[PDB]
């Protein structure tokens, strides 16, 4: 039983190393009557003629596997593809020795393909490790629009989902296009200072020069790149201090040849010990069937641990890519690529030298640049945020408390009255109350200035699916905060599970629940028979697109009440309270604090039943906000000493 192996190499001397390696494997693994034969051909310029020569020289023989190298002249995925098709028709495994493209790891296209060197997509994983080492959470991902960039982005995002984190934003730029500065401009406006680039060498050079022109290479910024962006024309224009990484062997053709021959020999011996091995087709012409053993040979080849390689342990993952590779972390110090670590498959260990960050800093830079100007969206809630017209000269009227102390007020910008009568301009008005005083104390404590504006549509926020939409999106304050119009929500925003998935909440600054307001006390909460038996006689509803609507929608037992309420929901709390007082609405379901304050101050109305959904109000911020901890600590301290009690006495007695 003679076993024949084939190879497509470049220099015709690599063929001699291939023959020497096959001789070594044939002696180390007992020859007996196994006789591992070796045949080889050289790469050809024309791809079609290369495929035809693959049929005529290698497939014509009883080849069990084909090795394929990469010519020194850069042609990217062009050169190893033809073999992968011709050998892929018959399910003959083909091992790439130096190819790095991610398209060859897609087993639906390149069926019988394996590789001894990981693709570029795996450079994301090592990046992830650094994000764990230096605790970087807010990152920008600058990937090219080609398939390789998309693969890198997908791999990094999948890694981040396990950690349950997210990239700040992803910027896909068309390959080979100039003036990507516009995209970079967006990266400048973000709060993240870490940029992870995945592009070709020319695109890397373009991005480097554009970032240099925009002062993105200064202090506080961190650049993470792969080997494509720190070699060739990219290295010359690379800004100082960037961190790239290189595979240890990478371009060592001979080491990969030896390792591949070793793994192939081991797999061949195992396969012939398995019996029922049939025979390769012996010629492309005539034979139109796949090789029956092919899938079994590939399955044996993938499940192989050749822990004797020149390049270390040789093992494959679920799609043939080399698992557990070694990377060297390189830092550009004074126009020299100094090695400042090694990624040994699972961790990165710093060994020598000192990391020089792009701004010349000698200390680890944080991955964010929290601003001082804070755009704060707020809503008009009667005991928390009073909104009043300002006087003719553009300043708030001086007013003193009943105790005799000045009332702090802020200048908000809101939509004057409802939409039809509005002149459609953000008129400046005067905002004050519980939440405004809390915000003033919080800004004084945390040392940040602010500008306050009202929510455009006057809704707290919910998820809705408009017809002919590909996805649902938050409206109101939640949509404003998620879209970026606001940086922080200072309003009676209820904390619930639906909002918490997309939004970070501070520790509650006020505990309350849900209650029912009625005119003139004949309802026993939401367990009352009339509540569960709706009729046209009894009308009850809440404010549209609020926490109460979310609460009622998510309960199957309350579905009929949800339908009845939805048929008559109101636009705002004040309108529904007025409707209740005007005998137009019988019961109003809302927050305990607002409803209790309304009943106490206005009289003529009473709250009924016990609180049936206890929660609290919290300051809403974007996910993984750097100062979420500081806001929570400040709120806890305010609760502890006296501040919340003082606010309660002053505003809502």
């Amino acid at each position: 039983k003679i076993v024949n192996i084939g190879a497509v190499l470049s220099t015709r001397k690599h063929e001699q190393m291939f023959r020497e390696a096959v001789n070594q494997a044939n002696k180390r693994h007992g020859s007996w009557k196994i006789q591992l034969n070796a045949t080889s051909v050289t790469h050809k310029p024309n791809a079609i003629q290369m495929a035809l020569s693959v049929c005529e020289d290698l497939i014509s023989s009883q080849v069990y596997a084909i090795l394929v190298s990469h010519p020194p002249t850069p042609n990217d995925h062009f050169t190893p593809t033809p073999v992968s098709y011709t050998a892929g028709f018959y399910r003959i495994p083909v091992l790439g020795l130096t190819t790095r493209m991610s398209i060859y790891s897609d087993k639906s296209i390149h069926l019988s393909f394996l590789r001894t060197v990981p693709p570029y997509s795996h450079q994301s994983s090592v990046w992830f490790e650094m994000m764990r080492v230096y605790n970087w959470n807010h990152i920008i991902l600058l990937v090219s629009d080609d398939h390789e960039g998309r693969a890198a982005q997908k791999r990094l995002e999948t890694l981040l989902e396990e950690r349950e984190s997210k990239a700040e934003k992803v910027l896909q730029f068309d390959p080979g296009t100039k003036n990507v500065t516009a995209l970079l401009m967006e990266a400048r406006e973000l709060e993240a200072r870490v940029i992870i680039l995945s592009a070709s060498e020319d695109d890397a050079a373009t991005v480097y020069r554009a970032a240099a022109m925009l002062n993105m290479t200064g202090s506080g910024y961190v650049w993470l790149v792969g080997e494509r962006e720190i070699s060739g024309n990219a290295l010359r224009y690379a800004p100082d201090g960037i961190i790239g990484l290189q595979l240890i062997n990478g371009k060592n053709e001979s080491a990969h040849i030896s390792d591949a021959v070793g793994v192939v020999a081991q797999a061949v011996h195992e396969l012939l010990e398995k019996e029922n091995i049939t025979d390769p087709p012996r010629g492309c012409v005539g034979n139109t069937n796949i090789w029956k053993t092919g899938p079994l040979f590939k399955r044996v080849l993938m499940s192989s641990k050749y822990a004797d390689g020149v390049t270390g342990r040789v093992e494959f993952n679920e799609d043939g890519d080399r698992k557990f590779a070694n990377y060297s972390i390189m830092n550009l110090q004074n126009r020299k690529l100094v090695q400042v670590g090694i990624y040994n498959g699972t961790h990165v260990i710093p060994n020598d030298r000192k990391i020089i960050w792009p701004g010349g800093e000698t200390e680890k830079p944080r991955g964010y640049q929290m601003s001082t100007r804070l755009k704060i969206v707020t809503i008009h809630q009667e005991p928390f945020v009073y909104v009043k017209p300002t006087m003719s000269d553009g300043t708030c009227k001086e007013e003193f408390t009943v105790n005799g102390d000045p009332v702090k007020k802020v200048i908000c910008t809101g939509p004057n009255d409802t939409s039809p009568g509005s002149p459609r301009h953000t008129v400046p008005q005067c905002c004050y109350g519980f939440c405004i005083d809390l915000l003033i104390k919080l800004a004084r404590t945390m040392n940040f200035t602010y500008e306050v504006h009202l929510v455009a549509d006057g809704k707290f926020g919910t998820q809705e699916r408009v017809n002919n939409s590909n996805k649902k999106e938050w409206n109101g304050m939640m949509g404003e905060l998620l879209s970026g119009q606001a940086d922080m929500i200072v309003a009676p925003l209820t904390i619930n599970n639906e909002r918490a998935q997309y939004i970070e909440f501070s520790k509650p600054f006020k505990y309350q629940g849900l209650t029912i307001l009625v005119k003139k006390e004949r309802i026993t909460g939401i367990n009352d028979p009339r509540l569960r038996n709706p009729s046209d006689k009894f009308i009850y509803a809440t404010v549209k697109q609020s926490s109460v609507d979310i609460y009622f929608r998510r309960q199957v037992e309350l579905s009929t009440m949800y339908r009845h309420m939805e048929k008559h929901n109101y636009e705002s709390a004040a309108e529904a309270i007025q409707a209740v007082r005007d005998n137009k609405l019988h019961a109003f379901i809302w927050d305990s604090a607002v409803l209790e304050f309304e009943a106490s101050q206005k009289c003529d109305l009473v709250t009924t039943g016990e609180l049936f959904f206890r929660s609290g109000f919290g300051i809403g911020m974007r996910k993984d906000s750097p100062w979420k901890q500081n806001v929570s600590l400040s709120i806890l301290k305010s609760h502890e000493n006296g501040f919340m009690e003082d606010l309660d006495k002053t505003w809502v007695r």
């Binding site: 049929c55 098709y85 639906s108 492309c284 005539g286």
Partner: protein
């Protein structure tokens, strides 16, 4: 006068080759009468395909290529895509085998497959589930390359849908010749689901269905939905395929090979017509197997753009940037009693049209009887216990926690002359009890109202109402406000009473 070459590989009968050379003077209807070329590779291997295409391109200056192949060929699509990448000739893959969508194509290629993506098939199948209200299903996938894409697609479609889908389990079985037959039978013995969605190739489908039949997973109470990959040679299905198996194909599934060739050549001719009308000149022919130019010429890029959006004989052949079809007319087919693939539903303009008001389950695997975990439940309308209402005007269907009940035909006036039913939404105490039971006992049901009688009464020896439905085997069980008495208990089997009741007298206090 564009030159279009047609490649073959379906082989089959030999005299049809004469038909191939008779294709000269039959495109007279299309504008700018086409110059056809007929070449047939009769082995379909990489060397033969490459040689045939090379000889074609070097002999005559062709404008496009129409390729048809056998259903079971896997890697031909990649070879055509590679050839189109090198020689920069717009190919058209019709028929089967090479029309299975190859989503990532080479950047410079013009493959233009005449097939439908896996995500679109998944969308149509989930529309069928929504139509018949099959919320709970189990996914069975083989180790076939692309099962990860299938799982991603089912999750994406399920998430972006209104109904609260209940994916019971996902298991990645292992099929193939002989293989490890164990551990697939064990897994198929723990599949508890009324609806099963399977992804596999033809041979793996046959193995899976033999294993499932051995595991009692066919017959009534089990519904199977598969994409086109599992089917092969729709003309003759295997004996292992269960009846009622549901798949989704394109409208050209029933068309003959001649009609498919005519449609492809028409697509090429109309694209050339639009390009010539907008540019004022005929498109330049393709190159050769020789040194390839490299950068794509603006003329080649513009001809491709005009070749994408083409409409022909009403139905449009708009092509995706990925090379497959966007918004095609889709046909939901199923295997009937006679083991023939027949049309069941249509999908035009994003709107489903099904021919069956309720899904028929006429499989004959009732040897265990217990295998049929599906029930036909009769009911009536009593205001506290069963309430009926019109379906939701917005999305049709029914409101959450409201079982869809079909009023029993229109037999009130249609005396056995009309098939269709009328959809309504049923809820109430008895319906909630039935839903609880469905979950506890793990059965599926078909709720329908009664139009003959109300509750049950012996009328000259025959029974009407719900008692009549159950007695004469038209319904497996009847639920509602059905009192237990001795007269009814002598002919049917009542259950444990779940609502106390009796005779009572009501008077006006005022």
């Amino acid at each position: 006068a564009v030159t279009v070459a047609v490649v073959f590989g379906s082989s089959g009968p030999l005299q049809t080759q004469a038909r191939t050379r008779l294709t000269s003077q039959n495109f007279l209807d299309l504008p700018l009468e086409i110059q056809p070329l007929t070449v047939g590779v009769n082995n379909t291997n990489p060397s033969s395909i490459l040689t045939q295409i090379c000889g074609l391109l070097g002999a005559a200056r062709v404008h496009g290529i129409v390729f048809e192949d056998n259903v079971d060929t896997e890697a031909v699509a990649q070879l055509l895509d590679f050839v189109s990448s090198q020689t920069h000739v717009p190919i058209l893959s019709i028929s089967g085998g090479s029309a299975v969508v190859l989503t990532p194509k080479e950047p410079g290629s013009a493959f233009l497959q005449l097939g439908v993506s896996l995500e679109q098939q998944l969308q149509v199948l989930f529309k069928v589930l929504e139509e018949y209200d099959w919320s709970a299903f189990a996914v069975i996938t083989s180790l076939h390359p692309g099962h990860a894409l299938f799982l991603e697609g089912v999750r994406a479609v399920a998430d972006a849908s209104y109904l609260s889908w209940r994916l019971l389990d996902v298991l990645t079985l292992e099929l193939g010749p002989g293989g490890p037959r164990a551990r697939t039978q064990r897994l198929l013995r723990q599949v508890d689901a009324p609806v099963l969605v399977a992804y596999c190739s033809r041979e793996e489908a046959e193995v899976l269905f033999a294993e499932a039949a051995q595991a009692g997973l066919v017959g009534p109470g089990h519904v199977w939905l598969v994409p086109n990959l599992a089917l092969g040679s729709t003309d003759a299905p295997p004996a292992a395929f269960p009846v009622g198996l549901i798949s989704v194909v394109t409208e050209s599934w029933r068309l003959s090979l001649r009609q498919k060739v005519r449609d492809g050549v028409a697509i090429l001719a109309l694209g050339a017509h639009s390009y010539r009308r907008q540019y004022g000149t005929l498109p330049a022919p393709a190159g050769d197997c020789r040194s390839h130019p490299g950068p794509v010429s603006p003329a080649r890029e513009a001809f491709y753009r005009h070749l994408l959006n083409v409409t022909w004989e009403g139905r449009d052949f708009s092509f995706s940037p990925g090379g497959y079809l966007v918004r095609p007319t889709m046909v939901v087919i199923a295997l009937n009693r006679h083991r023939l693939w027949e049309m069941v539903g249509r999908w035009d303009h994003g709107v489903l049209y099904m021919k069956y008001p309720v899904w028929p389950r006429y499989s004959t695997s009732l040897q265990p009887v217990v295998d049929s975990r599906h029930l036909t439940v009769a009911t009536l309308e009593e205001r506290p216990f069963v309430i009926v209402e019109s379906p939701d005007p917005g999305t049709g269907g029914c409101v959450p926690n409201t079982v869809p009940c079909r009023r029993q035909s229109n037999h009130t006036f249609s005396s056995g002359d009309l098939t269709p039913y009328t959809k309504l939404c049923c809820k109430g105490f008895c319906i909630d009890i039935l839903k609880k039971l469905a979950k506890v006992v793990k059965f599926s049901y078909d709720l329908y109202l009664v139009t003959n009688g109300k509750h049950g009464k012996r009328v000259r020896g025959v029974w009407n109402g719900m008692i009549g439905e159950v007695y004469y085997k038209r319904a497996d069980m009847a639920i509602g406000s059905l009192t237990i008495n001795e007269e009814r208990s002598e002919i049917i089997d009542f259950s444990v009473p779940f609502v106390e009741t009796g005779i009572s007298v009501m008077v006006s206090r005022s």
